[PDB]
Design a protein around this ligand. Structure first.
Ligand SMILES: O=c1ccn([C@@H]2O[C@H](COP(=O)(O)OP(=O)(O)O[C@H]3O[C@H](CO)[C@@H](O)[C@H](O)[C@H]3F)[C@@H](O)[C@H]2O)c(=O)[nH]1
Ligand SMILES: O=c1ccn([C@@H]2O[C@H](COP(=O)(O)OP(=O)(O)O[C@H]3O[C@H](CO)[C@@H](O)[C@H](O)[C@H]3F)[C@@H](O)[C@H]2O)c(=O)[nH]1
Ligand SMILES: [Mg+2]
Ligand SMILES: [Mg+2]
Lengths: 421, 421
């Protein structure tokens, strides 16, 4: 009863059965090489592998309930429901007594959907834990009313079947694409309801194991869209205020929990509040993380602080927090991202000083050339320096001053390419 | 009592802003150099009044315009038309043109006198023969591929002024090449009463009767030249002519650096071995040490510098920049080259930064908590590409971006660039 990774199993099947349902389901799991499973024999024996593949073939699909919180979502509720298809065995909408057409649109166009009511009490976990309560299926998947699936393809059913069949203990995250096109992978939206999992936290809630441990998240190749942060459609300030209210509530409940300090900092940052207050909150959070087994968001907190420190040019302090992050997360790309930002800033600074020194040492200061009386060669070098530091206005300005054809070409060439290309 | 031409200009700018004297003085560029003898005290408004009226009243010296021609049917009329009726005598010395050159002159310009003299590979001999044939006080030389922009009687005025103030010099109009570059030390106009003679078979120049090198004064007269326009002229043919005559001068006057500079320059135009050119120029610069003749040394040093910069011999380049600074403290080209060195090193740094980031962080199991797609890193690389003027690389990565927040900076650059057209 050996154990190997999902990726190891993938390899075998990519030789043995490239059209097996098992391989097709496995390849929905991202980061396959993480995560282990237990085999019940020698799978390099082609008979045993055929029996595994065939046993997956005829295994049942777990039942899955889709749970949806609603409050005043007439804008998008139909978009949401239509995107789900017919995968799910049940669709519960827990509505907080909407005064728009939300429930009318549901009753009218979606008679299969069950609508339950529960008044809002400023606790996302309470509402989501109520949906768990009402679920008949083996699994739940949560989608929000301002979300919609692109490529349904029965992938929810398939993922549930695979995870259950291979006895993997986890929460499942689809990918969630914001309206700007940025994709989030740690969402924690789909799990079995038979293990005593409960959400905790009034906002920025997450699923917690019944023993209080933090479950492993596995991201799957299912794309969900969101427009809840699109300023053309919604009042971003209203939601930022909702989040601040509930985050503050959570801080009062759970001081010394760094999670809420980070989110408080993050929300004040969206509202363009005093960065020194944000800075102090993040420093306190990072310090609190050291008392905590809970590590989620520590990287994100360090990186928000970094963004502020870089902006304030506190390079020494910034490097100390990058070093800390490098230690906590050896393979995190963001460290060298920031190390690179520091280097580039200094490069542009050096360039700017060179430009200024040249300009004002031969600012027509009587001094004479032997290469060009018009000093167009110096002007042309200054132009290159301007483009180098992304000061195109200064470039265009001095370009107009050029009294030549050879001097003008280098810039004209470059400009032509941009318009066309 | 003696003072500068600039001093007289100052006095007159207050007293007599419409005097001929001041109008004529202002044709002289670099007035602050050069001196003259006042006759007493010009802070007296009557003395100055008399000087002014004396100048108003003084005669214009006679000027002959001398032109060498060989097969200039293309441009001889453009040339003669541009001269106007200024001159007291126009002499063409023709080397037995086979084209229509002299027919055009005799048909369309009957007052012009045409003399013939077989070409003997010696520009000085031909120019001195023009001196012999001159009836005026002054000679001004123009070539057949030259044409005055706007006469304005400036030649007669310059001659009047220089003679009235007893200034000992050669006169240079400004000569503007087809590319748009202006040369100021051409040495084309002087009195034929002082035993001046041209020397050198090519790149010839006027020499005082005692062997000394006259002072050059540039005047605000624009002359155009298209004799280096490859559209119209066979440059290689002209280059071969000059190398031949230049080699003859090196045999006559070895150890005269002038001819080493010109031989190097000509071999360079013809893309000959840069090591040979370098060796010639180093030799020339070393011969300058032995000579009071300093003309073309700055140009020799700068040609060498161009070559050394191209070969990336930065230490040697800096020695020759330091020499040029010691010789020409106020020459702008030293700082130009010092800036080129620093800009090149900066771009190298930027290039290595780009290469290091891209190779360590893209597509290789390192992860981000900022953006899982790594578009923030790609966005920074795009910035680096633009900084070093590699837009094609920038365009390529730009297309990989999925976030519009990531796209924004490059889009606005390009958008703002676009509106400037
Ligand atoms: O009083 C209320 C307010 C909202 N709702 C519903 O709950 C869902 C919450 O998502 P909403 O779009 O409002 O919050 P958002 O900031 O976009 O979501 C994140 O933040 C949420 C809160 O942490 C999280 O649940 C979500 O998954 C994140 F993406 C949505 O479908 C609302 O209709 C409600 O029923 N009653
Ligand atoms: O065999 C010949 C060849 C040319 N000529 C004439 O001499 C003049 C100068 O020649 P050209 O303009 O071709 O020489 P270029 O290289 O442009 O002039 C420089 O180089 C010249 C050579 O030092 C210098 O005189 C000139 O002022 C510089 F700008 C021009 O008007 C020709 O028609 C000639 O009469 N017999
Ligand atoms: Mg939402
Ligand atoms: Mg010419």
């Amino acid at each position: 009863a050996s154990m190997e990774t999902l990726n190891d199993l993938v390899t075998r099947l990519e030789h043995s059965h490239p059209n097996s349902s098992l391989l097709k389901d496995l390849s929905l799991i991202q980061g396959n090489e993480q995560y282990n499973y237990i085999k019940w024999g020698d799978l390099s024996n082609s008979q045993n592998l055929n029996e595994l593949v065939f046993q997956y073939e005829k295994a049942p699909y777990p039942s899955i309930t889709c749970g949806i919180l609603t409050y005043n979502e007439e804008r998008c509720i139909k978009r949401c429901l239509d995107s789900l298809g017919s995968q799910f065995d049940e669709i519960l909408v827990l509505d907080s007594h909407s005064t728009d057409n939300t429930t009318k649109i549901i009753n009218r166009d979606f008679p299969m959907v069950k609508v339950i009511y529960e008044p809002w009490i400023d606790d996302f976990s309470f509402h989501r834990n109520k949906l768990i309560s009402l679920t008949s299926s083996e699994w739940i998947y949560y989608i929000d009313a301002d979300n919609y699936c692109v490529d349904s393809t029965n992938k929810f059913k398939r993922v549930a079947k695979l995870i259950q069949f291979l006895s993997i203990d986890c929460i499942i995250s689809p990918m969630i694409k914001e309206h700007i096109g940025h994709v989030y992978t740690d969402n924690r939206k789909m799990f079995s309801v038979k293990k005593g999992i409960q959400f905790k936290g009034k906002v920025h809630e997450e699923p917690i194991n019944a023993d209080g441990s933090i479950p492993q998240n596995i991201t799957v190749d299912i794309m969900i869209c969101h427009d809840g942060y699109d300023p053309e459609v919604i009042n971003l300030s209203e939601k930022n205020d909702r989040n601040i209210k509930l985050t503050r509530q959570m801080m009062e409940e759970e001081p010394s929990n760094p999670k809420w300090l980070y989110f408080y900092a993050r929300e004040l940052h969206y509202a363009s509040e005093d960065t020194h207050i944000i800075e102090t909150l993040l420093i306190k959070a990072i310090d609190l993380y050291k008392q905590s087994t809970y590590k989620r968001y520590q990287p994100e907190a360090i990186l928000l602080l970094c963004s502020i420190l870089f902006q304030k040019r506190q390079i020494r302090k910034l490097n100390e927090y990058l070093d800390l992050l490098e230690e906590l997360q050896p393979l995190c790309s963001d460290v060298n991202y920031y190390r690179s930002l520091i280097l580039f800033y200094d490069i542009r600074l050096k360039t700017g000083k060179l430009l200024d020194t040249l300009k004002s040492s031969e600012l027509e200061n009587n001094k004479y050339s032997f290469i060009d009386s018009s000093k167009d060669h110096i002007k042309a070098l200054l132009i290159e320096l301007y483009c180098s530091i992304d000061d195109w206005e200064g470039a265009f300005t001095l370009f107009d001053e050029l009294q030549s054809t050879e001097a003008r070409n280098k810039f004209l060439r470059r400009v032509k390419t941009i318009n066309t290309h």
